[PDB]
């Protein structure tokens, strides 16, 4: 309850509290699975940790639910893991998990994520249709005729 | 987990909307009168029975009016007949809302039929069958006569009267049973939209006595009710045919059940309107009393023509399947001997899996050749 | 966390569900009905919005529905809401139960899966393709159509019985298992009703897998309909055939035939064009036996003295059950040995017994 709902009100945090759980969120990262002290972190509004925590380790399902936590849940919006732990993205850096991320969140921010990994025209031709199959995002030019 | 729970989060709120919603117009409309009207309306109707403490009907209890009670009980409580002299009541004899004779008739009408029947018809009749042209493929020669036996007299009864005659009053079908056989009956049944009674002799012999007799009557009863109706029997062999198994002595009623069927169908039944049709494996089993004219007149096989009939029949069938238009059904039909307008689907219908095994849209010649082989070999019967 | 949100979600759903204003209106519609009311059985119907009924005490009164619910929801000869006044139909009443038909194994997507039964696959395609394939219903669409049923042969409990539920599990329709000797009765005509009751279910609960085991008895045409020959034999079968030759499916209600007495039966009892399929279980050849062996042998715990080939070659061409069966008493010997890991000796023993 320390840093939490600074998230909700907007138009904070004790490293004591913050660092205590930096045994814990890793205690959850040593488990690599799954969900608990992330929520503790979503509270934390620290733009170090969320870049800093998992740059490595986990994948599949695993970082897929790290994502919705990264931008949305903290008092601010965040990216870095989705550039950062995103980096290694072994099984296609990042193709495998990020497209599981590119779906859902009826968004587009994960459009590069596929771009970055998807390198084949024809893997992208499927991504092209995949970006196309969201037409509203893909239909207007400036995405269309540029991405389109 | 988390992101999925967002979907799960959306799940909860979404459902709460209707919950919130449903309460809304709920406030608006405020359901007695759909019934409480009709209820109290028909409560009169209820009470319209309830005076004097009172289409099969079975029993009318229209009860205890003594001056008067105007009802039949066919039942072990207070059996009743209104008659003995001129005994009626202006619209309705009396009460129960039930007004009438039960089933068992006492005088006439009286209150228009309260009647008729218990056990519905335990036999059941599909009118205008799902078959009109359905198995009619390749079946012509038969139907050619059937139409005469059935269709035309249903169509233009006058001609036979214009001639001075009727249609064949009863007709036989044999070969592989019901195969298109019954459906073919069902065909012209629905071709002519006459009432098609499918009654299997299996229905006829049951745990008790007068069994089909009871039925055959109710049959013959609602025959005339359903007039211009096809009484159709698959399994004339169910009740059996001619036999001496009365020499054993237990079969007698089963034998009689035929004789029942035999007796009543003979004298009074219009068979130009009420059609009677029989389906068997063995025409050899007939009780000749069946084969009697004015009972059975026309006699027909199902049947199994030639190379040619099959082709069309094949051609007929395969149109369901995606089929190779190069290969000839004539080619296939050449190979197979004569066989059933059912079996000829084994020609086509089996090849679908061939077509799926061969993963074709359109089964090849061999696909059917194999099927021809496969099926016919697979018979060994 | 979301579990809480999930639970209350489930909870809020319960509330709205119970929330079925309309409640009063619904109660208004109940307050219509009055109470307590009277059970009673249907008889026939007319548009009259008056119909009479059937009772054990046998009052039969000509009565309306209280009309929001429907006549056509129901059939003649069915128990209906009745008042105690005129026995007025209060509305749609089940008369749910009917939990009986003649003799059957009442089961659906059954335990047996083709994996379970030891590898028979060569004929599994037969049962798969004829049934399981249109069960997917996807390809059978283009296929234009699918046979009725199959005919098992070989031995039950390995070929016949094991296979039987394999596709029955696989297709996950209502598997209905019966024996003709589980019909009759020696009496005439409900043998058909037996079937009917079955076919009532079969018609009702579609999709379903009809099974049939060992027609030794109700199925024999003999040469004769007279001179001691029990009608019911054919008398049943024919009707069984009527519902058999009166129906084949595109992948809905599937049939199974399991027995060793083959030509005891009519050709149209098969009716090719309809039943195209003879399954016949053989003694599994050493490999195919080994195929079943490794399954049941290994799923039996044992000591490494054991070897399949040690068992395989030593064999007379056993049934795929005898595999199981050897394997069976094999451990029983180890149980007589009171041990949890079986030697190879018990196997040879258990087999050379069984």
Account of the 3D structure:
- Chain A: Acts as a regulatory subunit of the 26S proteasome which is involved in the ATP-dependent degradation of ubiquitinated proteins.
- Chain A: This is 26S proteasome regulatory subunit RPN1.
- Chain A: Belongs to the proteasome subunit S2 family.
- Chain A contains 8 helices and no strands.
- Chain A has helices spanning 15-30, 37-42, 49-52, 61-69, 96-102, 110-117, 121-133, 135-139.
- Chain B has 13 helices and 5 strands.
- Chain B is flat.
- In chain B, strand 2, helix 7 and strand 3 form a beta-alpha-beta unit.
- Chain B is an alpha/beta fold.
- Helix content of chain B is 42%, strand content 6%.
- By secondary structure, chain C is an alpha/beta fold.
- In chain C, the strands form 3 sheets. Chain C has a 4-stranded antiparallel sheet, with no helix packed on it. Chain C has a 4-stranded mixed sheet with strand order 5-7-8-9, sandwiched between helices. In chain C, strands 6-10 form a two-stranded parallel ribbon.
- Chains in contact: A-B, B-C.
- At the B-C interface, helix 1, helix 2, helix 3, helix 12 and helix 13 of B face helix 1, helix 2, helix 3, helix 4 and helix 6 of C.
Task: Give the helices and strands of chain B as they follow along the chain.
Answer: HHHHHEHEHEHEHEHHHH
Radius of gyration of chain B: 30 Å
Tally of alpha and pi helices of chain B: 13
**Spatial extent as radius of gyration of chain A:** 17 Å
What percent strand of chain A? under 5%
Major β-sheet of chain B, in short? 5 strands, parallel
Helix content of chain A: 40-55%
How far the N terminus sits from the C terminus of chain B, by CA atoms, comes to: 61 Å
User: For the report, how would you describe the main beta sheet of chain A?
Assistant: none
Order of helices and strands of chain A: HHHHHHHH
Number of strands of chain A: 0
Strand content of chain B: 5-15%
* Class derived from helix and strand content of chain B: alpha/beta
Q: What are its keywords?
A:
part of a larger assembly; 3 chains; B: 381 residues; alpha/beta; 5-stranded parallel beta sheet; 6% strand; C: 354 residues; 4-stranded antiparallel beta sheet; 4-stranded mixed beta sheet; 40% helix; hydrolase
Write the layout of secondary structure elements.
The structure is cut from a larger assembly and holds chains A (148 residues), B (381 residues) and C (354 residues).
Chain A (H helix, E strand, L loop, with lengths): L14 H16 L6 H6 L6 H4 L8 H9 L26 H7 L7 H8 L3 H13 L1 H5 L9
Helix pairs in contact in A: 4-5, 5-6
Chain B lengths: L3 H17 L1 H8 L6 H15 L89 H16 L1 H7 L6 E4 L7 H12 L2 E6 L10 H15 L3 E6 L17 H16 L7 E5 L8 H4 L6 E2 L7 H12 L10 H7 L7 H15 L7 H15 L2
Helix pairs in contact in B: 4-5, 4-6, 7-8, 10-11, 10-12, 12-13
Chain C lengths: L1 H17 L3 H12 L4 E5 L10 E2 L24 E4 L6 E3 L13 E4 L12 H16 L1 H5 L7 E3 L7 H12 L2 E4 L12 H16 L2 E3 L20 H15 L7 E2 L1 E3 L8 H4 L15 H14 L8 H5 L7 H17 L8 H9 L1
Parallel strand pairs in C: 6-10, 7-8, 8-9
Antiparallel strand pairs in C: 1-2, 1-3, 3-4, 5-7
